[PDB]
Amino acid sequence: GKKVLIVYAHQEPKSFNGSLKNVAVDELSRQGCTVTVSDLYAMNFEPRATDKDITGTLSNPEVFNYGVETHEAYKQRSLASDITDEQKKVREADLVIFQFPLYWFSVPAILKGWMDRVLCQGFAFDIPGFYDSGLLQGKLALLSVTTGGTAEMYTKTGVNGDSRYFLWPLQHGTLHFCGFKVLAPQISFAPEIASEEERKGMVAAWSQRLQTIWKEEPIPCTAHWHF
Amino acid sequence: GKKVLIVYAHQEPKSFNGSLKNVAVDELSRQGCTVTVSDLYAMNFEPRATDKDITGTLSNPEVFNYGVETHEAYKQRSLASDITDEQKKVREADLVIFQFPLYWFSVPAILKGWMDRVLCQGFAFDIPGFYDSGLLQGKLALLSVTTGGTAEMYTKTGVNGDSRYFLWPLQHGTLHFCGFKVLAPQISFAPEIASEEERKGMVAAWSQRLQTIWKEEPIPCTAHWHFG
Numbered sequence: 001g002k003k004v005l006i007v008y009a010h011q012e013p014k015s016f017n018g019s020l021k022n023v024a025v026d027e028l029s030r031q032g033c034t035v036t037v038s039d040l041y042a043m044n045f046e047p048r049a050t051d052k053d054i055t056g057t058l059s060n061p062e063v064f065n066y067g068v069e070t071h072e073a074y075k076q077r078s079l080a081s082d083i084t085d086e087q088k089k090v091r092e093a094d095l096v097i098f099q100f101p102l103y104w105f106s107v108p109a110i111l112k113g114w115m116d117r118v119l120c121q122g123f124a125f126d127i128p129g130f131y132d133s134g135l136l137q138g139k140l141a142l143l144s145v146t147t148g149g150t151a152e153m154y155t156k157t158g159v160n161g162d163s164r165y166f167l168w169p170l171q172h173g174t175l176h177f178c179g180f181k182v183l184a185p186q187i188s189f190a191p192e193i194a195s196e197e198e199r200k201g202m203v204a205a206w207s208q209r210l211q212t213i214w215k216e217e218p219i220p221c222t223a224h225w226h227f
Numbered sequence: 228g229k230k231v232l233i234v235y236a237h238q239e240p241k242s243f244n245g246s247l248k249n250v251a252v253d254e255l256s257r258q259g260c261t262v263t264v265s266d267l268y269a270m271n272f273e274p275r276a277t278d279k280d281i282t283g284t285l286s287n288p289e290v291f292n293y294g295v296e297t298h299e300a301y302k303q304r305s306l307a308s309d310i311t312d313e314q315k316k317v318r319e320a321d322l323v324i325f326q327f328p329l330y331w332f333s334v335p336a337i338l339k340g341w342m343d344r345v346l347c348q349g350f351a352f353d354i355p356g357f358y359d360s361g362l363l364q365g366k367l368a369l370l371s372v373t374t375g376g377t378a379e380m381y382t383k384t385g386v387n388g389d390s391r392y393f394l395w396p397l398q399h400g401t402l403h404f405c406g407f408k409v410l411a412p413q414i415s416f417a418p419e420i421a422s423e424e425e426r427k428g429m430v431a432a433w434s435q436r437l438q439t440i441w442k443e444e445p446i447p448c449t450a451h452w453h454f455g
């Protein structure tokens with residue numbers, strides 16, 4: 001069987017993102033998959049990287065270095081429990097789906113904080129395991145993104161440039177760097193202005209796509225693919 | 228005389244970022260510029276875009292849409308005051324410098340939340356009224372980024388790819404979109420690896436650049452500049 005984690009970052013259960021997350025839960029559950037959702041806003045997930053992320057006393061209360069203190073805290077099982085809970089769900093997952101509206105060509109800050117705080121050194125990567133050989137090798141990852149801007153605006157010679165340009169920090173700089181094989185993003189362009197039927201069509205396409213998700217080939221996560 | 232806002236996102240005043248921020252304050256201050264710093268971590272700045280950011284009646288209370296609601300609250304002056312306090316600093320600023328460690332090929336979340344919450348519709352852009360028509364037209368912006376990776380790693384054929392690839396969402400998708408003229412980024416590679424002399428050299432190079440900052444032209448903030 002397979003374990004799926006959906007990390008979901010939208011304020012509103014009735015939203016289009018809400019529906020995409022619920023269709024993913026229904027379909028993967030139907031297939032017999034083990035499903036877990038991290039609903040960041042409902043958890044009121046803490047996005048800031050602070051000394052509060054380390055329980056007990058710090059490895060150097062003089063000069064606070066977040067990257068080093070969390071690395072040492074991981075190794076010695078001394079991270080705050082919101083972080084260690086997320087890492088447990090990630091560790092056990094076979095597929096991690098991120099479900100979010102595009103904010104400023106990127107993830108909402110709440111989801112940026114999950115990545116900043118949960119994918120720490122020792123857990124997600126280390127000197128030996130950057131990129132291919134990142135500590136999360138074996139796992140699949142998939143961005144399901146909704147946009148304000150239409151698909152035409154997101155072309156090579158449109159104002160916004162190509163969709164693949166903004167994916168680079170997330171797919172390559174984050175997911176690939178951690179060891180993830182990355183599946184082709186799912187992008188539901190401009191739902192707010194699509195018809196009720198185009199909306200239905202995008203939701204169903206997602207459901208339909210999750211049906212064969214495990215047969216999918218990972219993208220080549222490379223400068224060429226993105227650019 | 229000019230006004231500068233530095234939006235600063237580091238936890239530790241004694242850090243290399245802390246130093247880059249202090250030399251900017253000192254140098255622009257010495258020039259006789261008006262300088263403001265938003266020290267996000269010290270302010271415990273709130274990064275989450277929630278319905279707490281609107282204090283008035285919601286437009287559509289049945290289904291909460293963050294961007295719709297904050298556009299409305301902006302026009303109504305019913306946005307939370309931590310947001311309107313930042314907007315006032317930006318509105319008055321001639322130049323906005325962002326000072327931050329690269330986190331996951333991007334800004335730390337606290338700073339992403341600043342962008343998410345402060346650069347709202349009605350204030351920073353409108354639909355239509357973005358890119359060259361963005362509402363913050365006439366303002367300069369500059370990213371001053373520190374990295375863990377070396378300059379060599381951040382090349383066209385390096386593992387990380389070219390450093391300019393990760394600037395795209397920030398420079399073009401955010402700053403250019405709001406109407407800023409974007410100045411060439413200041414990238415301070417791998418200070419943790421660098422020697423004492425090399426670090427001091429990076430701090431002085433920033434300081435030195437700031438002397439002539441008002442004489443600089445913006446980058447062409449285009450696909451070609453970023454990707455070739």
Ligand SMILES: Cc1cc2nc3c(=O)[nH]c(=O)nc-3n(C[C@H](O)[C@H](O)[C@H](O)COP(=O)(O)OP(=O)(O)OC[C@H]3O[C@@H](n4cnc5c(N)ncnc54)[C@H](O)[C@@H]3O)c2cc1C
Pocket residue numbers: 010014015016017018019100101102103104105106145146147148149150191192193196199200203276290292293294342343344400
């Ligand atoms: C701070 C900020 C930054 C942003 N930056 C960008 C950016 O850089 N680039 C960009 O393109 N956009 C950007 N946006 C816009 C944003 O990405 C879009 O508003 C968002 O992706 C839309 O997704 P949603 O789930 O909130 O849509 P919703 O408004 O919640 O959904 C659209 C409609 O679909 C309906 N719906 C819900 N479920 C279903 C269903 N099952 N079937 C049919 N209809 C359904 C809803 O009721 C609604 O009427 C930004 C927005 C904000 C607030």
Ligand SMILES: Cc1cc2nc3c(=O)[nH]c(=O)nc-3n(C[C@H](O)[C@H](O)[C@H](O)COP(=O)(O)OP(=O)(O)OC[C@H]3O[C@@H](n4cnc5c(N)ncnc54)[C@H](O)[C@@H]3O)c2cc1C
Pocket residue numbers: 065066067115116117173237241242243244245246327328329330331332333373374375376377418419423426427430
């Ligand atoms: C969550 C997270 C994600 C990250 N993601 C990335 C990434 O995607 N890509 C990447 O490349 N890196 C990444 N990093 C690494 C990160 O960007 C670096 O650790 C950071 O940029 C270094 O900046 P700093 O100010 O903290 O350095 P510091 O550790 O504070 O500086 C290094 C040295 O400089 C010294 N120093 C301070 N001031 C001065 C001065 N006045 N003169 C001389 N020396 C001085 C300090 O004492 C210290 O010894 C990430 C780190 C974290 C924690």
Ligand SMILES: COC(=O)Nc1ccc2[nH]c(I)c(CCNC(C)=O)c2c1
Pocket residue numbers: 066067068071120121173177331375376377380387
């Ligand atoms: C413990 O501190 C972090 O969490 N660091 C962190 C996280 C994600 C990262 N991606 C990339 I490239 C780097 C640069 C790696 N540094 C080198 C190459 O010497 C990086 C660093």
Ligand SMILES: COC(=O)Nc1ccc2[nH]c(I)c(CCNC(C)=O)c2c1
Pocket residue numbers: 104105148149150160293294295298347348354400404
């Ligand atoms: C809902 O209110 C927001 O805050 N929306 C928001 C914010 C930043 C944005 N950048 C980019 I491209 C877009 C797409 C704009 N939509 C168009 C042109 O149809 C965008 C939208």
Ligand SMILES: [Zn+2]
Pocket residue numbers: 171172173176177220221222223
């Ligand atoms: Zn890659």
Ligand SMILES: [Zn+2]
Pocket residue numbers: 398399400403404447448449450
């Ligand atoms: Zn641009």
